[PDB]
Amino acid sequence: MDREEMIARFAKFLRLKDLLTVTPKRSLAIDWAHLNSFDPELADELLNNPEEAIASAEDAIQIVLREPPLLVEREFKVHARFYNLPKTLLVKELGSEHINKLIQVEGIITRVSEVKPFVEKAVFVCRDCGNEMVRLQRPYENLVKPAKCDACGSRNIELDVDKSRFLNFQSFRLQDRPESLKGGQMPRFVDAILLDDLVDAALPGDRVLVTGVLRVILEQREKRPIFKKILEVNHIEQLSKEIEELEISPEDEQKIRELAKRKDIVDAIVDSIAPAIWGHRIVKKGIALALFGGVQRTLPDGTKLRGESHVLLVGDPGVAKSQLLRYVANLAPRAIYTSGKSSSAAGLTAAAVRDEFTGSWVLEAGVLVLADGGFALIDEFDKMSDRDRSAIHEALEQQTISISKAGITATLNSRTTVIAAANPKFGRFNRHKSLPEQLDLPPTLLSRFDLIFLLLDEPDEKVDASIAEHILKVRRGEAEAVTPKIPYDLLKKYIAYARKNVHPVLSREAMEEIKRYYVKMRKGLRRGDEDGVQPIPITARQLEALIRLSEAHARMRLSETVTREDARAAIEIIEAMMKT
Amino acid sequence: MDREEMIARFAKFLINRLKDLLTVTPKRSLAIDWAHLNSFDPELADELLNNPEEAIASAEDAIQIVLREPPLLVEREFKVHARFYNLPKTLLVKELGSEHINKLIQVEGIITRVSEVKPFVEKAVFVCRDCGNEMVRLQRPYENLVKPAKCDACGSRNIELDVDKSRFLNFQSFRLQDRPESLKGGQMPRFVDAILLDDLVDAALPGDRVLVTGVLRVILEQREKRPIFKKILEVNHIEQLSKEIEELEISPEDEQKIRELAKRKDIVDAIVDSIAPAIWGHRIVKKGIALALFGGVQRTLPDGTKLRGESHVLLVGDPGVAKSQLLRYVANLAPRAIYTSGKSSSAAGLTAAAVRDEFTGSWVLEAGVLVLADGGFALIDEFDKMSDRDRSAIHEALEQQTISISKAGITATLNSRTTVIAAANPKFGRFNRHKSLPEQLDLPPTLLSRFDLIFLLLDEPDEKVDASIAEHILKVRRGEAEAVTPKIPYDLLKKYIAYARKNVHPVLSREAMEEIKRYYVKMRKGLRRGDEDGVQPIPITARQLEALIRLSEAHARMRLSETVTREDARAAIEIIEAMMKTIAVDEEGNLDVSILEVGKSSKKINKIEKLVDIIKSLESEGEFGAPEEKVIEAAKQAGIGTKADIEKLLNELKSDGRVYEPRAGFYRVI
């Protein structure tokens, strides 16, 4: 417990190879498993007494930096970071028992603050006498002012910024991942604070594995409710992909046996949606190709390929905007239900907020930024925010949201295949009017969507009958109309596993079938469709929507190669987006 | 009392109760019972109720003395729930008084507010740097700034607190209100704020009935001052038994209800008994509200699939003196109902919202009438009168069965499952058949299509047929059977609703499903036509087909759970056909007026008016482009509308935001 000898016990341990390559850097990542082999009581003292043990670990770096084998320039700016800990907490695992204890909480960053300076050493001088007082203010403490002078006792003791040392400060809200943790309970957020060497280490909207010490802030008058769970961050690093992705290792032998059946294409379509719908089969294929997205390969020399197929499901509010966005959100991973109009200031994209405890322009990440690899099935896309409309074009052509706001100039990567759907602005639209003019969406925005399906309550005889027969039998509870072929938990593991391992590559026979379709759609039908200023039916951007659906149909097969019949399945669904 | 007297008595009785608590050290509680302690010593059970301040603390030390013995020296389970789960008397919020202060009592009710889990500062030590005086000052939850002015050794003023030396426990503030199920008519519910502590916080959210037990404390009253009205109930034992105290009830009249249900006209007898016989003039309109008192079948399915069976009846365009307001007081016979208007006189409103509290500075989440009345009904006297913030959450509360409150930052998403039988007065003094339901109401058109049944009552204008039947059944009704003639009582009919909603679960047959499928497909072709440059209006939408099965499942609940529901499916579709004969019947069964503010012919004529406006919107023939005098001649010649009809559509485009007007005589498209 004595810190005069604790630096000597740390000298036997000092993680030594990491210090030689990070001696220009300002942080030393020390693994606790290396410390657990040397002394298990010392590694347990990090979690029990985190205030003084890290300070002795900060001291012991400077001892081996001034050692006769390892003498360097004396650098007191050495952060004693500890990445690994033998316990990882949960959404609501933070409590009063972990106050002043080194804990590890995983989550996502929802809100962040701007780059602000903090008064670490708060030098206070007086106006009447001039007492050169010094007081080190902690970053985990509330903003405090000294009452009287130590010499005469006056109210003129103020903080001068010339003789006061500063330290880089940033605060971020650690609202953890809502992946049905703690039984699907309401997520609780614990705001953290970043240090000088840990500032700008992570953007709002990434999966982060961050440790820290939970401390309290006096805020109110009552002793029980004056507490702010502020996590003094010791080390921040990205979350590993193994905890992020789903464990499909019990579901590995079932999905390979599904490739033995020749009906694997039709199996992952009627089970991706509920069987109680019994309608929009070509749109059921469109939502199935949207989940199994194309390959997100990186083109060389600084470029990227879009492997996301955004399906526009706009149409009549009677059939569309009804249960098509809810069954997919429970099946697809990282899918968050969001409406176009919301009480949140962010909404769809990442909209900045000016209100803080400091007052700087904070950045609140939207649902498209919190869905890295997810599916933001946006409902009511017509009544979107006007501030979100300036950044919704960049999120669908680059999967990035550049906010360019005050204090935060870094972009926010979306990486979210959105399935948007909207009411018409006029109501009860038809094909007699043009499609992108009669909606709230601009015509340049509807070209970003790869598939535009139309849904309407048609008065046809069999279409009214097939809904009337199927909605009545699903109320009675027959298994032929309710139970799908494959279980919903099996298909939910089939989506996350197919995107990780297998990747469709182009073949020679598959590209030849696209040559016969492209030249046929614009030999005379090009001149017939346009009037000189009218847009072209199929362009080079429309070809990117076709080869994405070609790899989407092969991802359901997981055969790793595309064929002529596989590309032919992508032909008829592209033609359905043009005709309807 | 003595110190070791209650410690030796509690250690003799309690052992097997501490052996199960030793297996789970993080629980640190025990499910004590009043009947178990009174069987060993009756004086020990009465001593804890009269003084729970220090007797329960010595009893918690008695469990620690059993854990610190020579044979059993396990240093676990220091804290224990000394408050027993079973109690001899269970007090209520309405029967609460000042005679039970500083004592152990059990309060039953529902939770309305819930604060965030924050750390509570307890046993705050204070050590100075210049003097170094070791002294601890106990701080309570209601106390504020409990610190000395100077040290006891040298009188130092720079005293610092030690967070590591002090104890930090969990804290949560909750408000317990009266339950609306046991609350009868003409009752004012009182609210009482409680405090949740470590190993008891985050027990229940707002919108559900939860039981509370513990010591009832009060704020400190200084000398020569006014009496402090602040009272805090320190809940210690965490138990959920308030649902079995109110909802779980034995019905001995179920054997007599089998004789009444075996006869004929049982559905018509319950409709005449649940409504006042003085209010007359509507039979099929009152039958829809009587069928809405019994719910349907709500079963779970895979992948989050569910179907609500709560039919919401909403009436708009009613008269000034309407019998539906008097029937709204008779609509409270259903269980778990709350008779409150749309203006809830609070910051939360009908839905759940975050309201600032003055007792606790932390942010809490309140619950409205749509959350606290889950599993029952919620009658609204003024459905049109509502806040704009409450209207943004009403579209998801009645559709997704959840309030989805996420503005507080915690994203609680309280459940909103209440069969709302509401009514809304019109904005004008009189109602007309020319105006639609969305134009004659302040609410949006999305809330009108969600209602399964929509009725509109109106009397006859001529006094030869109206006044000869109105005052004839009301003048002789004074002191006679014409005002009230219930064959069964209101409390007897409410007892049969609990046995049918919880135990009875009917299902329709294939012949009953064929009656609803053929009738929906026959009317779809009777009103089908071809719309020029537009879409034809559908007679019955697919969302309305799910409400036709909800009216069939409600009538099957009173049919003694018959498998062949063909007898009740005919009256269920006929009740929806009577609502569709007047409402959503603009062009020919046009359901576009229910799903949207503009109808099918109202949007086709506006699209025909757009052809006469966008053809010259850029060419400024008059004061601006598309002049109103030129567009009226273009619309009258093309058959869009007359001069008075285009003037009603010119101002409708300015209100909806389609076409504005810079000056008089010129209307430009926005």
Residue numbers in the entry:
A (entry chain E): 1 to 14, 29 to 594
B (entry chain F): 1 to 14, 27 to 682
Give me lines lifted from the publication on this model.
DNA replication is a fundamental process for cells, during which MCM helicases play essential roles in the initiation and elongation steps. Tko has three MCM genes (mcm1-3), among which mcm3 is the one essential for DNA replication. To enrich the MCM helicase on cryoEM grids, MCM was randomly biotinylated at its surface lysine residues. The average number of biotinylated MCM particles on the affinity grid was 316.2 per micrograph, compared to 7.5 particles per micrograph without biotinylation. We obtained a cryoEM map of MCM-apo hexamer at an overall resolution of 3.26 Å. As indicated by the local resolution, the MCM-apo is highly flexible, especially at the two peripheral MCM subunits. The MCM-apo structure shows six MCM monomers, interestingly, arranged as a left-handed open spiral. The MCM-apo forms double hexameric rings, but flexible relative to each other. The main difference between MCM-apo and MCM-ATP-dsDNA lies in the appearance of the WH motif: in MCM-apo, the WH motif shows in every other MCM monomer, i.e., B, D, and F. While in MCM-ATP-dsDNA, the WH motif shows from the second MCM to the last monomer, i.e., B, C, D, E, and F. While Tko MCM-apo constitutes a wide-open gate (20 Å), large enough to fit dsDNA, the open MCM-Cdt1-apo from human and yeast has a very narrow gate (4–6 Å).
